[PDB]
Amino acid sequence: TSTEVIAHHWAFAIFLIVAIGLCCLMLVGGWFLGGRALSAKFYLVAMFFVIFDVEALYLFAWSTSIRESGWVGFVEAAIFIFVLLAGLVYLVRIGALDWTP
Amino acid sequence: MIPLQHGLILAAILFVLGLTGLVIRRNLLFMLIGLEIMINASALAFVVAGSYWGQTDGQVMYILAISLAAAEASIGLALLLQLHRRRQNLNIDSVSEMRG
Amino acid sequence: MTITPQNLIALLPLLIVGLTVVVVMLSIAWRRNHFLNATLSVIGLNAALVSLWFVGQAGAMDVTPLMRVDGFAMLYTGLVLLASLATCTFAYPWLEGYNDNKDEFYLLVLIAALGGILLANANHLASLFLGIELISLPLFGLVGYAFRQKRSLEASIKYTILSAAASSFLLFGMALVYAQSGDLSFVALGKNLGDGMLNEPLLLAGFGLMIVGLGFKLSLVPFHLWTPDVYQGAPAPVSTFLATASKIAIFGVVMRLFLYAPVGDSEAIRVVLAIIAFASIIFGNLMALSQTNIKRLLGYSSISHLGYLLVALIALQTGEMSMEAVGVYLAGYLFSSLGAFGVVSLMSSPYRGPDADSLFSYRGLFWHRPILAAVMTVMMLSLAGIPMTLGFIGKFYVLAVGVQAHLWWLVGAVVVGSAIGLYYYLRVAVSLYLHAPEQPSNWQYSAGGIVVLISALLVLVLGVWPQPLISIVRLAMPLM
Amino acid sequence: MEFAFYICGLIAILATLRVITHTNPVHALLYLIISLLAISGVFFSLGAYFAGALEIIVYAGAIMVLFVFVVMMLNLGGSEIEQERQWLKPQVWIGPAILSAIMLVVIVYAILGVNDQGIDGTPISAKAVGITLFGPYVLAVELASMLLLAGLVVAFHVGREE
Amino acid sequence: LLKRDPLNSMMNIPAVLSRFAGKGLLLSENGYLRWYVASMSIGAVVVLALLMVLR
Numbered sequence: 001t002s003t004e005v006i007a008h009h010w011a012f013a014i015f016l017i018v019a020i021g022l023c024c025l026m027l028v029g030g031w032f033l034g035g036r037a038l039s040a041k042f043y044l045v046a047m048f049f050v051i052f053d054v055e056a057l058y059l060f061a062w063s064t065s066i067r068e069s070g071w072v073g074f075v076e077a078a079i080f081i082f083v084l085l086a087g088l089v090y091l092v093r094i095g096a097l098d099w100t101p
Numbered sequence: 102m103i104p105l106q107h108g109l110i111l112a113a114i115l116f117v118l119g120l121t122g123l124v125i126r127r128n129l130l131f132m133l134i135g136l137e138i139m140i141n142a143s144a145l146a147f148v149v150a151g152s153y154w155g156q157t158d159g160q161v162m163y164i165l166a167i168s169l170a171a172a173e174a175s176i177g178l179a180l181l182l183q184l185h186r187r188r189q190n191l192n193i194d195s196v197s198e199m200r201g
Numbered sequence: 202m203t204i205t206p207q208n209l210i211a212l213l214p215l216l217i218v219g220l221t222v223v224v225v226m227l228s229i230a231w232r233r234n235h236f237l238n239a240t241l242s243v244i245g246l247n248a249a250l251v252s253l254w255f256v257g258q259a260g261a262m263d264v265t266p267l268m269r270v271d272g273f274a275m276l277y278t279g280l281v282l283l284a285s286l287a288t289c290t291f292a293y294p295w296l297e298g299y300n301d302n303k304d305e306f307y308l309l310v311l312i313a314a315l316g317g318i319l320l321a322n323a324n325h326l327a328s329l330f331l332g333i334e335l336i337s338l339p340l341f342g343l344v345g346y347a348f349r350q351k352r353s354l355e356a357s358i359k360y361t362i363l364s365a366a367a368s369s370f371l372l373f374g375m376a377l378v379y380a381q382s383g384d385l386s387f388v389a390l391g392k393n394l395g396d397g398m399l400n401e402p403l404l405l406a407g408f409g410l411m412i413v414g415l416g417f418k419l420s421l422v423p424f425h426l427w428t429p430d431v432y433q434g435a436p437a438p439v440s441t442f443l444a445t446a447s448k449i450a451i452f453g454v455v456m457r458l459f460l461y462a463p464v465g466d467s468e469a470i471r472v473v474l475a476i477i478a479f480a481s482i483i484f485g486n487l488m489a490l491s492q493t494n495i496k497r498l499l500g501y502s503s504i505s506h507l508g509y510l511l512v513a514l515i516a517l518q519t520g521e522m523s524m525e526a527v528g529v530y531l532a533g534y535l536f537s538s539l540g541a542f543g544v545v546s547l548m549s550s551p552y553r554g555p556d557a558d559s560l561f562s563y564r565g566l567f568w569h570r571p572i573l574a575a576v577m578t579v580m581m582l583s584l585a586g587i588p589m590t591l592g593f594i595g596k597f598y599v600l601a602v603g604v605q606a607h608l609w610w611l612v613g614a615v616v617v618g619s620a621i622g623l624y625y626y627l628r629v630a631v632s633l634y635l636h637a638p639e640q641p642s643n644w645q646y647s648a649g650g651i652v653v654l655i656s657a658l659l660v661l662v663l664g665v666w667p668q669p670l671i672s673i674v675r676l677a678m679p680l681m
Numbered sequence: 682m683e684f685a686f687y688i689c690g691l692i693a694i695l696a697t698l699r700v701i702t703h704t705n706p707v708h709a710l711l712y713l714i715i716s717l718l719a720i721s722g723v724f725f726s727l728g729a730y731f732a733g734a735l736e737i738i739v740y741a742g743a744i745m746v747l748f749v750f751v752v753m754m755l756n757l758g759g760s761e762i763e764q765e766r767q768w769l770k771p772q773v774w775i776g777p778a779i780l781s782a783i784m785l786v787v788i789v790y791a792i793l794g795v796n797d798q799g800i801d802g803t804p805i806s807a808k809a810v811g812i813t814l815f816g817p818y819v820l821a822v823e824l825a826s827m828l829l830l831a832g833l834v835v836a837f838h839v840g841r842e843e
Numbered sequence: 844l845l846k847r848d849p850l851n852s853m854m855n856i857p858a859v860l861s862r863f864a865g866k867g868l869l870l871s872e873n874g875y876l877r878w879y880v881a882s883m884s885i886g887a888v889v890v891l892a893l894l895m896v897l898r
């Protein structure tokens with residue numbers, strides 16, 4: 001409820017509103033003005049991205065509290081990263097990540 | 102100053118709408134979409150419950166929920182691609198050879 | 202709380218199975234070898250059994266806020282590991298007939314066994330949900346392993362869509378329970394209630410949606426319709442695993458949840474589970490009556506047998522031997538289903554391709570497979586609850602549990618469903634010995650035959666002499 | 682923080698209602714992305730900042746991308762279901778709509794009557810979620826890694842082309 | 844009048860009812876996934892309504 005916090009909230013709201021309005025108004029002006037007269041490897045890559053992004057979010061949560069988690073948290077994240085790297089090595093070696101076989 | 106009942110009711114509304122979409126839609130892709138709506142509503146309910154009690158367990162439940170949602174979405178879309186490649190048809194009623 | 206070295210030695214089957222998953226994956230990445238990767242998976246599962254011995258040498262304690270290891274956990278972990286080992290043994294000749302990659306099968310079997318172990322040790326809604334999902338997703342892969350075959354792809358799609366819906370139901374019910382009760386541990390689901398206010402509407406509704414998810418997973422009526430389709434369409438070792446390990450692990454975590462939760466002795470939940478048990482017994486036995494397909498028949502059979510187990514669960518808060526009955530019945534059901542689905546797997550192995558039919562054709566099996574016919578008729582007698590078989594010992598335990606708790610409708614349901622089971626089981630067992638007009642050579646097929654023969658001998662011997670099994674299940678006591 | 686919650690919840694409800702009754706897959710996925718943005722706004726209104734961040738990052742930013750990838754790869758141009766439009770026929774949707782409405786009334790009746798002092802909205806940071814995640818939920822993290830591994834192996838085995 | 848055993852017939856009618864009820868219950872196994880989802884949601888409605896009624 002600080003005045004700095006509410007001022008920054010208002011500034012963020014005005015930033016988003018004015019930015020989206022600027023883009024929309026620029027397209028509106030562009031439209032109104034002026035006269036008139038597949039392979040499955042894409043799925044594989046996107047699916048690998050989704051899986052590795054969820055494992056990335058796990059590491060995202062770990063990274064902000066490494067000191068509070070101590071060495072036992074380091075050991076757990078090391079097991080997590082080793083399993084993730086084993087899966088990555090598996091995908092590379094079986095040709096799943098090889099774009100040109 | 103938001104009641105827990107309102108967040109839970111919103112999650113129930115989203116769960117019901119996702120289940121309706123899962124039942125009434127004959128396309129397999131829209132069934133998968135309704136499944137995502139259902140599991141996202143469940144994760145929203147867990148977040149509302151955790152934020153009422155002031156505990157981090159609701160967001161951890163959300164994290165496990167979206168890990169399941171990601172993995173089951175990938176599996177379902179792989180099965181959808183296999184069905185389209187085998188039959189050139191996304192009809193969930195046509196894949197019904199096994200019956201009592 | 203943290204993880205001590207004592208917590209590490211209690212965690213040993215989970216750690217060994219996870220390390221086996223990593224090692225098998227790295228061996229797959231190094232070179233695609235069927236024999237060595239199957240060997241590594243079965244070595245990891247046997248090492249997990251010996252790890253269960255080492256866990257038994259340690260004490261019973263809570264390894265996490267999430268896990269609790271006791272004799273209950275050791276018993277159901279051992280059941281899951283035995284089912285996984287038998288699935289790998291049955292899977293090798295069937296995969297030898299396969300043409301595509303045949304080691305991701307073993308990776309998925311190991312991950313599903315890891316989920317089974319987690320469900321055996323699950324003391325939390327977190328570990329319950331995660332164990333259910335870790336059972337389910339590798340089974341999505343395994344059920345549609347032969348996706349080029351039409352029936353396997355159809356069973357995969359059905360199981361995937363319905364299990365995603367059931368996991369959504371279970372997760373929403375968990376969220377409602379957590380909304381009512383501020384803790385997610387099993388012991389705390391209903392602690393903040395008193396003076397006869399156990400029937401909180403939100404706690405009951407959350408437990409009902411969890412009942413929807415768990416009753417999908419246990420093939421309980423009215424969440425049972427997927428069972429014959431997924432059982433028939435899946436590969437036969439996958440049918441073995443889905444019949445044994447998934448149901449055993451999920452029903453064990455349902456045991457621990459209803460034993461620990463203070464709302465587990467609610468009258469409304471007891472009546473709803475009694476209705477589901479009655480309907481499951483009657484409906485599964487009635488629906489297996491006119492089945493010419495062996496796998497659909499075993500699916501409806503699983504529906505009825507899980508109804509009997511649910512009857513044993515209903516008396517958990519009234520009698521005392523409910524956990525004992527569930528353990529004995531689950532050991533007997535495990536060995537019976539292992540034998541029956543193993544005969545079905547051995548006669549469907551090697552794989553004949555996605556185009557060729559995979560019909561069992563059990564009529565006249567004795568004239569070319571006499572030992573397999575004897576094993577299958579021992580299983581058919583055991584699943585019928587015939588005395589001299591372990592299935593009768595389980596049925597006797599269920600009947601004693603129901604009689605103690607005065608569950609007369611459930612006892613009559615068991616009697617009626619048992620008579621209907623006698624009809625269709627004896628139909629199969631005597632069709633084994635008739636005459637049919639018309640319609641191996643490696644040690645892994647012989648190993649599968651050894652597995653089903655040892656299952657037959659176990660069923661017969663423990664039906665005649667059930668005292669060692671009763672003594673084993675009695676000392677596998679959970680925390681009171 | 683109450684106004685934000687109510688408008689975002691209303692936007693989410695309207696968006697999924699337009700998701701389940703739409704015919705074009707890309708339009709349905711777009712309304713689904715809008716619903717996920719609104720639900721992340723609901724998360725931010727309640728103080729679950731990490732949850733809203735992951736809702737945009739992962740759910741609306743990875744999984745919906747996979748859905749859009751699949752839709753543009755299969756090239757749905759009205760394969761006999763757009764021209765049929767069976768889900769908007771009353772005889773098809775009236776049954777499940779009453780069934781879902783009954784389930785909604787039962788669940789909502791269960792929701793009401795529960796004691797409720799209100800959601801405070803105090804922010805639960807990603808710091809505390811990370812502390813819980815690698816503290817009392819270590820096995821959840823490792824077995825969730827194995828779960829995502831299983832999903833990876835299954836989706837590779839099924840979804841590859843050859 | 845009794846040459847075709849009447850007591851045997853009135854004791855065999857439970858088998859007839861069993862076959863009829865099994866054939867009737869096998870109509871639910873139509874093999875349609877959308878009906879399976881509908882049946883799960885119907886069972887969810889029934890279980891929730893039973894829990895609210897019984898309390």
Ligand SMILES: CCCCCCCCCCCCCCCCCC(=O)OC[C@H](COP(=O)(O)OCCN)OC(=O)CCCCCCCCCCCCCCCCC
Pocket residue numbers: 250251253254255257258259260261271272273275276279280283532652655656659669670673676677678
């Ligand atoms: C023979 C008849 C048929 C039996 C079928 C059984 C099927 C399930 C197989 C696994 C069952 C494991 C059950 C373990 C229950 C243990 C309960 C318990 O508390 O045991 C305690 C005991 C040590 O005693 P205590 O001094 O109390 O220790 C605690 C002191 N801090 O600790 C122990 O006793 C340790 C127990 C170790 C068990 C190791 C099992 C290895 C695998 C055996 C497989 C047998 C073959 C079955 C299948 C054949 C092929 C189909």
Ligand SMILES: CCCCCCCCCCCCCCCCCC(=O)OC[C@H](COP(=O)(O)OCCN)OC(=O)CCCCCCCCCCCCCCCCC
Pocket residue numbers: 607609610612613616617
């Ligand atoms: C289709 C075939 C199967 C049919 C269904 C299964 C059997 C159904 C039997 C129904 C019994 C109804 C009992 C009604 C009262 C129950 C509550 C009660 O007060 O019970 C009395 C008593 C428990 O009270 P308590 O203080 O412990 O007294 C002990 C001394 N009696 O109770 C006891 O101590 C125990 C009571 C035992 C009751 C009888 C159990 C055996 C039944 C034999 C077979 C069924 C009847 C005959 C066949 C009918 C046609 C098939």
Ligand SMILES: CCCCCCCCCCCCCCCCCC(=O)OC[C@H](COP(=O)(O)OCCN)OC(=O)CCCCCCCCCCCCCCCCC
Pocket residue numbers: 490616617620621624854855857858859861862
């Ligand atoms: C006097 C009253 C008091 C005493 C009651 C005592 C009850 C227990 C002892 C009596 C049990 C009577 C059972 C009667 C039916 C026997 C089974 C039978 O007839 O099987 C043969 C028949 C197959 O022959 P078919 O007709 O050619 O086959 C058509 C399908 N292909 O099979 C079929 O057609 C299908 C068979 C279905 C499964 C068997 C029937 C189960 C019925 C319920 C059993 C429990 C009954 C409880 C009491 C009921 C009322 C008396």
Ligand SMILES: CCCCCCCCCCCCCCCCCC(=O)OC[C@H](COP(=O)(O)OCCN)OC(=O)CCCCCCCCCCCCCCCCC
Pocket residue numbers: 001005009013682683684685688689692715718719721722723725726727728802
């Ligand atoms: C106006 C009528 C409708 C017009 C069309 C729709 C436009 C978008 C409407 C919804 C989004 C904006 C809602 C209004 C938010 C205004 C800011 C606000 O309420 O801030 C309060 C709170 C600040 O945080 P806190 O510190 O807790 O505040 C208490 C004081 N310390 O804030 C918070 O805690 C979090 C604030 C919300 C989260 C950020 C915004 C999320 C936006 C989601 C957009 C979804 C897609 C919209 C599509 C629109 C077109 C269909």
Ligand SMILES: CCCCCCCCCCCCCCCCCCCC
Pocket residue numbers: 070071072075076079204215216219819820823824
């Ligand atoms: C606070 C200082 C601690 C120093 C010692 C740290 C190392 C000892 C404790 C290690 C605990 C490791 C727990 C790992 C669990 C992995 C579970 C995997 C399941 C598949």
Ligand SMILES: CCCCCCCCCCCCCCCCCCCC
Pocket residue numbers: 567575578579582634661
């Ligand atoms: C102790 C086990 C009891 C149940 C199993 C029964 C099977 C025993 C071993 C096989 C017996 C085969 C008998 C076949 C007889 C065929 C006769 C045909 C010509 C009349």
Ligand SMILES: CCCCCCCCCCCCCCCCCCCC
Pocket residue numbers: 483609610612613614617
């Ligand atoms: C379609 C198959 C139907 C099978 C029905 C089986 C029914 C068995 C008989 C049940 C009898 C229950 C008697 C209960 C008496 C309770 C008395 C309580 C006194 C306080």
